[PDB]
Structure formats: structure tokens, C-alpha cells
From a paper:
ChRmine is a bacteriorhodopsin-like cation channelrhodopsin (BCCR) more closely related to ion pump rhodopsins than other channelrhodopsins. ChRmine displays unique properties favorable for optogenetics including high light sensitivity, a broad, red-shifted activation spectrum, cation selectivity, and large photocurrents, while its slow closing kinetics impedes some applications. ChRmine is a homotrimer with a central pore between subunits, unlike all other channelrhodopsins of known structure which are homodimers. The general topology of each ChRmine subunit is typical of rhodopsins, with an extracellular N-terminal region (amino acids 2–26), seven transmembrane helices (TM1-7, amino acids 27–270), intracellular and extracellular linkers (ICL1-3 and ECL1-3), a cytoplasmic C-terminal region.
Author numbering:
A (entry chain A), B (entry chain C), C (entry chain B): 2 to 285
The structure:
């Protein structure tokens, strides 16, 4: 696209940039391949667990089939895998893939477009494991945050005269994210405290460690994406391009693969009375 | 974009128009600022009410947290605020924002793209207050109507040879809107009549006035948007550009801020028996 | 859009192609008109049935109003009609409509963009009639399949150097589709077998034929779209353009109009005990 006052051509958000040669080196391609392989493996494992998923009483034939919330995390991984497959194709075809082409929600040819479909699922699943209140609201807040990030990317990659708008959108996102983060942490802490005071002088003591570790670590590890934005060329620029791709791949692996594996481990050790305690949690 | 048979350049739906200088005067900018401020204030107030929301029995700790339908209206305002924030940034950066750039659902850089995410929420919330039937169906109809409006905008702002298609889409939308409007009015009337015959010789007589006023006024006041389309330059052209922005800001304020404030007022006076009557309404 | 190394201009995904003259002959226009008329008729009939829809006990006033799953199929037809109306306008205005213009989910100006909104509804409705498990999961799989098809279309209609990516995406879609197809067939078979062993020595024997025919035929007839893709110019090229439009119109008619009519016929003959059997089906 052309801009007034200059002859420079800007390829962001246009089909012209879709046909440009790729700007990535071998490191980014290797990171994309590794993330795709890991996501495929985790998707297959979660699908296998969902198929052979007896209930907490180990009596229901298809427990995840009738109560599909247990499949929610699986969905994330599956869609995440899709969001990487296209990337892989790009590195095989040698054409540009960064912030060019059509805007499709759930497809990661834009920086935060793929997260806009899976992040609410992640927040809902994390809050649902403790039967916490304010599940859909946090998902809506996260959806708005990712929309703000997408607009920040559009403003950052465009005409220089409209560069400060990127910072403005980033600030908006950060403000609301801080609010949501604090709320989520408080809610999680309260819920876990109640669970700890419900399981006193009672078994299932080992599974509580796994649940606590998973929920707390994978709720606190969401600060990585704003820090990456701060250090990427859109911010300070401490790490150049082709290294923010590796950082995003590592963040996606930690946020999705490890979280799904932790939930799979937790669902393999809990039993009826802990399920009843979890049900009692969401009653007050 | 270029068009056959002419050298004229059309900037609708392109990234070229995203970098163009703004066409708005100070009045439209002031209207955008006022609407953003009002939406921010209402979002904060609704969030505060949702946090300190005891149930109708005034016993539940987090009533809106576990039954999140009460938060629905809040969501609208929040997203509406987002849809204006970007607009604000545009007026600060001095670049064009009308029907240019990427197409993101829920972002108001296109005329009716932002309404496509919040209008079904508004219809569902309005029909849910009376426990009325046909809630999701009306939301789907409204979603289709806003899609028709978006396509009408695309046809209107494009090549002149394809201008009549705008009118065609407008007609489609109007037809279905008339159908939905009649259906909604009938349903609301019937439900309120039943409520009036359920609360006879019973208290809670003051809150019925507030509920009736809110539901009836904010269901009838949806005719304003087709009239604005009729009088805007896309239709007759009685009011020029930079004044349809003020009209849309006023319509958004009335449809969202006042509706949320009215529901907040209603939820502050009703009690257990009116809640039981509302539950009895959705049983037949 | 321009591509490096050549002066050829590619109109896919651009606003430039929106203003180009139409490439369709009279046969494609007639097929579009026939499909639009059929979808309009079925939408009106399904709306009439939904309005005058007594329950299985023939006692509830608005059965579909309070339990809106019965309206789900109707929604499909309605949206399908919208997806054709715009097409009709294009043939009246004489401008290009194939894979050009804005990308709107649910609007069929791209090949598989309209199916991405109605196909999950179709899968959920088909699996819900037997109270089968894994309803939302199959809908998500189908949504991913249609996204893969859309990306395949983008790669196929673009620069020749990036043509093999179309095949790659097609393969991805086919793989996952095969998985989903097998799963769906197995589930349906098991559910129907249980229903057959629940209605033994019991009436409602005529409605079982209609249910079996509808579910089995309209689950098996989903293989037509991959075969059309295989034989269309994007694949082997056995049938040229302007004949894949007729094939897609016929496939849409069979998949939506006939399915809705079959469900309407089935809902006109079943009664209380078959409803209780259907409820018993989803319990194990
Ligand atoms: C603006 C965007 C905000 C996004 C906020 C939402 C974030 C995502 C929320 C995910 C919600 C859960 C998705 C899966 C639904 C599964 C629910 C379910 O199976 O149970 C519900 C219910 C109760 O069954 P039980 O009694 O447990 O059965 C036991 C008897 N054998 O049964 C049903 O399945 C009824 C259907 C309810 C769900 C209907 C489908 C809703 C789908 C919504 C979209 C989900 C994806 C959201 C993606 C967002 C991308 C922007
Ligand atoms: C083609 C688009 C058509 C759009 C049609 C839909 C319009 C919007 C409809 C909004 C539906 C309501 C959204 C909020 C869901 C909250 C429901 C809820 O909290 O209760 C449901 C249920 C029952 O709980 P109770 O028994 O009341 O709890 C008491 C025990 N302590 O609990 C649950 O939350 C289960 C989850 C159900 C909801 C799952 C999430 C669904 C989200 C769908 C998308 C919503 C946004 C739609 C935006 C549309 C934009 C195009
Ligand atoms: C990533 C995309 C994956 C898509 C997966 C989802 C595929 C579509 C699933 C469709 C789910 C059903 C849609 C219609 C919801 C209607 C449910 C309903 O009416 O009952 C639910 C419930 C129970 O009522 P009963 O007790 O039966 O009432 C009897 C008392 N008189 O009541 C409610 O309506 C509560 C609200 C629940 C539904 C909330 C709305 C959810 C809308 C989700 C989006 C649907 C469209 C999806 C389009 C997908 C396009 C990508
Ligand atoms: C699997 C992916 C996950 C969990 C992604 C999470 C992403 C965020 C929490 C992103 C946050 C952002 C901001 C707070 C500010 C603006 C930009 C973002 C998108 C990096
Ligand atoms: C907060 C915003 C609200 C409630 C918006 C409501 C908008 C409408 C009812 C719009 C209707 C339209 C038509 C009936 C015809 C075609 C164009 C529209 C979009 C103006
Ligand atoms: C009403 C429309 C319906 C039921 C459409 C169904 C479409 C499919 C099952 C399409 C499948 C595809 C693949 C399996 C591979 C890639 C391309 C598609 C989109 C043709």
C-alpha cells in the first residue's frame, strides 16, 4: 500500500506481501518445526486420553464424550497445531508469512490472530478446574486483550507517521491485562484455600500437589508474552527479529503442551471424593 | 483499488486508505470522545456492581460470578468502549478510519462491524429479563441484519457501477428486521401481560414500572439505526457526513449506556418474590 | 497484487478483483437462482413449523421457543439463503464474486467461508437427533476442515510458485476429515443399534425408518465436497469452471434442503415414548 508524502511501499495487511520472499533464517524455521511436532504429539496424546477416558468413578464408558469440558484443552492444542501447520508450509514454499495476506481468526499468519481463538479456551479451562467464578468474563477480557495486541501489530508494522498508535494499543492491553491478572490470581488463591480447608484429615493428598502446581504455574506464566512484546523490535528492540519467533514458540510450548500434559497427569490420579470436593467448591 | 473503465482510485476495503488523512472535523472528534468517556464510565460502574452483587435474596457472595448472564450487559459496554478507543487513537493520529484497513469482527473501523459482536448480546439480555422465548433466534436474526448492513456499506462506498447493490442489501436487512421487530414486540408484550397478571394483589409494584419502561423503551428505540441509514448520504443525504457520526454516537449512548443504567437501577429494588415470578414466567 | 519476478497481476484476495467483470455464464447464474429459491422456500417452511411447534406430547405452546435446539437446522437454511443472496446480486450487477473482496465469515464470496458458520450447526444437529456423544468436538473438527479448505483455495488461486501449498492444505483437511468421518459413522451406528434394541416389541416403528434414512444418508453424503474438489480445476480438472458452481449448488441443496425437510417429516410422526427412548439413549 502507498502512503501520502512518500514513495515507500508498505506490505502489511496486503496481498502483495503474501508473495514476497521469506525473511526468516534457519533458526526460526527449526523453531516452527519443533513447535509443530510437539503440538502434534500432544494433540494425539490428548485425543487418545479423551477416547479412553473413564470417569472419576471409573464406570462411565465415554466420560469426555457426554461432558465435553474435559476435551476443552485438547481443542486448544489441536487448533494450535493448525496455526503452526500453515507456518510450516510457508517455510517450505519460501514466501512471506508475517502479518501479510488475509485476516482469518484462528489462523496465525498474523501475530496474535491465532491466540484469539484458543486463549479464552485456556482461561476457561484453567478456571474450571477449580470451579472458580468469573469464567466467561475472564475469557472475554483476554479476547479483548488479544484484539488490542493485533491492532498494535497493525499500527507497528505500518506507516511510521502512525507508529505511536501501536504503543497506545499496547498500553490499553497492558492495563486491562493487569486488571484481569490480579482478579484471576485472587480468585484462584481463594478457591485453592477453600479446597485445602476441605481436604483436611482426608486422602487424595498427592493429587492436590499436581493441581496446585499446574494451576499456579500456568496462571503466573502468562506474563511472558507482554515481556516478549517489550523486548521485541516493536518495543525496546533488545532481541532482533528471527529470535522473537523462537521466544514465541517456546512460550506456546510451555503454555499449551506442558499445561495439557499436567492436566492429563492430574486426571490420572484423582478419584470420587476429590471430584465431590471440587463440586462442593462451586457452591459457597 | 483500481476499477475497469476508469482511472479513479477507490480506497474502500484497502490498506491504502488506512494511511490517508482524516476527513472528520472537530464535531465528530468531540462526539467520539464523549461517547468513549460515557462508555468507560458505564463500564466501570457495571463492573463495580457486578463485583458487589448480592443475589435477590441478598445472601449469595458472588451472585454474578456463578450465574454470569447478569454480566452480559456489562460485556456489551466493555466491548463498545474498545470499539471507540481505536477511533479515538485515529483522531489523535490524524489518519483515515472510515471503512478502511483490516476487517476485524468486533472492531469498529467498519461501520457495523462492531455491532456484530454486541447486538446479539443486547437482544439476548433484553429477552432474558422477562424469561421470554426465542432468545438465540432473535440474536441470529440481528447478526444477519448487521452482516447485511456491512455488505451494504461495502457496496455503497465502492465503484459507482455497483452502487445499487447497497440498496439491495439494505432492503434485505430491512425486511428481516421488520419481521424480527414485530416478533420481539409481540413476545415482550405477552410476557409482560403475564407478569402483570401474576403480580396482582402483590407487592413489588414499583420495580414493575422500571422493568416495563426499560424493556419497552429500549426495544422500541432500535428503529433509529435504519432511519439514520435512510437520512445519511448512503440514502437520501439529508444530513451530510461528519453529522452521521454524531447521530451514531448518540444512538450508541442511548442504546447501551442508558440500557445498562436502567438494568442497574432495576436490579437494586427487586427481591425474592419478583424473582420467583420471573422464574414462573418461563414455564407456561 | 504484484508478485516478484513477473509482471502478472493476481486478483485473489484483493479489492481490485471485486470490480472485475463476472466470469460466469448463464448456467451458473441459473444454478445460483435455483439454489436461492429452494433455500428461501425451505427457510420459510422451517420457520412456519417452528412457530406452530407443539411438543412431542402436543401440549407445550412454543416448544421450539424454549428449547431452541429444534431451531438449529432452520438457522442453517436461513444463513445459507443469505450466502446465496449476495451471489444473486453479483450476477445481477455483472461484477466478479469469486474469491475477491473482503473476507467475512459466514458470507460466501469465498468458496468455503460460508460453510464455516453453518457446517458445525449441521454436525451438531445431526449428532443431537440420536443424543450421540462428541457433538462439539466434531463441530470443531469440521470448522478446522473448512478453514483448511479456505487456505487451500487461497493457495490455489494465487501465484503459481505457491501452488503446491494448496495440495498440502487439501491433504491436511482430507486426513482430518477421514478421521472425523470414521468416528461419526461409528458413533451413529452404535447409537442407532441401541435405539433398535430399545424399541423392540414397541410401537413408533414407522418413525424409526425416517430417522434411520435421514441420519445415515445425510451423514454419508458428506463425501461429495472432497470429490468435487478432486474433480474441479483445483484438482484433476475433469470438469471446467462454471460447472463446479452447479455441482456445489446441487450439493448444498441436498445437504441442507433435503436434510431440513427430512427432519421436518420426522418431527411430524414421533410421540412421547420415542422421545423418552431418545432421552434414555444419552445416558448409558
Ligand atoms: C467474545 C468471545 C468470548 C468467549 C467466551 C467463551 C470462552 C470459551 C467457553 C467454552 C465453553 C465450553 C465449550 C464446550 C461446551 C461443552 C459443554 C457441555 O458439554 O456441557 C454443557 C451441557 C450440560 O451437559 P451435562 O449435563 O454436563 O451432560 C451430562 C449428561 N450426560 O450440555 C451441552 O453440551 C449443551 C450445549 C452447551 C454448549 C453449546 C456450545 C457452546 C459453544 C460456544 C463456543 C465455544 C468456543 C468459543 C471460542 C471463542 C473464540 C472467540
Ligand atoms: C451466529 C451468532 C449467534 C449468536 C447467538 C448467541 C448470542 C449471545 C448469547 C449469550 C449466551 C450467554 C453468554 C454467557 C453464558 C453464561 C451462562 C451461565 O453462566 O450459565 C450457564 C450454565 C448454568 O449455570 P447455572 O446452573 O446458572 O449456575 C448456578 C450454579 N452456581 O453454566 C455455565 O456457565 C456453562 C457454560 C455455558 C456457556 C458457555 C459459553 C458460551 C459462550 C457463547 C458465546 C457468547 C458470546 C456470543 C457473541 C456472539 C458474537 C457473534
Ligand atoms: C470453534 C467453533 C466450534 C463450534 C462448536 C459449536 C457448534 C454449534 C453448537 C450449537 C449449540 C446450540 C446452539 C443453540 C443453543 C440453544 C440451547 C438451548 O436453548 O438450551 C440450552 C439451555 C437449557 O435450556 P432447557 O433447560 O432446555 O429449557 C427448557 C426450560 N423451558 O438454555 C439456554 O438457552 C441457555 C443458553 C445456552 C446457549 C447459549 C448460546 C450459545 C451460542 C453458541 C454459538 C452458537 C452458534 C455457533 C456457530 C459457530 C460458527 C463458527
Ligand atoms: C497459548 C497462548 C497464550 C496463553 C497467549 C497469551 C497471550 C497474552 C496474555 C498476551 C498479552 C498481550 C498484552 C497484555 C498486551 C498487548 C499485546 C499482547 C498480545 C502480547
Ligand atoms: C448498540 C447498537 C445497536 C443496538 C445497534 C442496532 C442496529 C440495528 C438494529 C441496525 C439495523 C440495520 C438495518 C435494519 C438495515 C441495514 C443497515 C442497519 C445495519 C443500519
Ligand atoms: C452445507 C455444506 C456442507 C455440509 C459442507 C460440507 C463440506 C465438507 C465436508 C468439506 C470438506 C473439504 C475437505 C475434506 C478437504 C478440503 C476442502 C473441503 C473444504 C472441500
Amino acid at each position: 500500500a502507498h502512503a501520502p508524502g512518500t514513495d515507500q511501499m508498505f506490505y502489511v495487511g496486503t496481498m502483495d506481501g503474501w508473495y514476497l520472499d521469506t525473511k526468516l533464517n534457519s533458526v526460526a524455521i527449526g523453531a516452527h518445526w519443533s513447535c509443530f511436532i510437539v503440538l502434534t504429539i500432544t494433540t494425539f496424546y490428548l485425543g487418545y486420553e479423551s477416547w479412553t477416558s473413564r470417569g472419576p468413578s471409573k464406570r462411565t464408558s465415554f466420560y469426555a464424550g457426554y461432558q465435553e469440558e474435559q476435551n476443552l484443552a485438547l481443542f486448544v492444542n489441536f487448533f494450535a497445531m493448525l496455526s503452526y501447520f500453515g507456518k510450516i508450509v510457508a517455510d517450505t514454499l519460501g514466501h512471506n508469512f508475517g502479518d501479510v495476506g488475509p485476516f482469518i481468526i484462528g489462523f496465525g499468519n498474523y501475530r496474535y490472530a491465532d491466540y484469539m481463538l484458543t486463549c479464552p479456551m485456556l482461561v476457561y479451562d484453567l478456571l474450571y478446574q477449580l470451579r472458580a467464578p468469573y469464567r466467561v468474563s475472564c475469557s472475554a477480557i483476554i479476547f479483548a486483550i488479544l484484539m488490542s495486541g493485533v491492532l498494535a501489530e497493525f499500527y507497528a508494522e505500518g506507516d511510521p507517521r502512525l507508529r505511536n498508535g501501536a504503543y497506545a494499543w499496547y498500553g490499553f492491553g497492558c492495563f486491562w491485562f493487569i486488571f484481569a491478572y490480579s482478579i484471576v490470581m485472587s480468585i484462584v488463591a481463594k478457591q485453592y484455600s477453600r479446597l485445602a480447608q476441605l481436604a483436611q484429615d482426608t486422602g487424595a493428598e498427592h493429587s492436590l500437589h499436581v493441581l496446585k502446581f499446574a494451576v499456579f504455574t500456568f496462571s503466573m506464566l502468562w506474563i511472558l508474552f507482554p515481556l516478549v512484546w517489550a523486548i521485541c523490535p516493536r518495543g525496546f528492540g533488545w532481541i532482533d527479529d528471527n529470535w522473537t519467533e523462537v521466544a514465541h514458540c517456546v512460550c506456546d510450548i510451555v503454555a499449551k503442551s506442558c499445561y495439557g500434559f499436567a492436566l492429563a497427569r492430574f486426571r490420572k490420579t484423582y478419584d470420587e471424593e476429590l471430584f465431590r470436593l471440587l463440586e462442593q467448591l462451586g457452591h459457597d
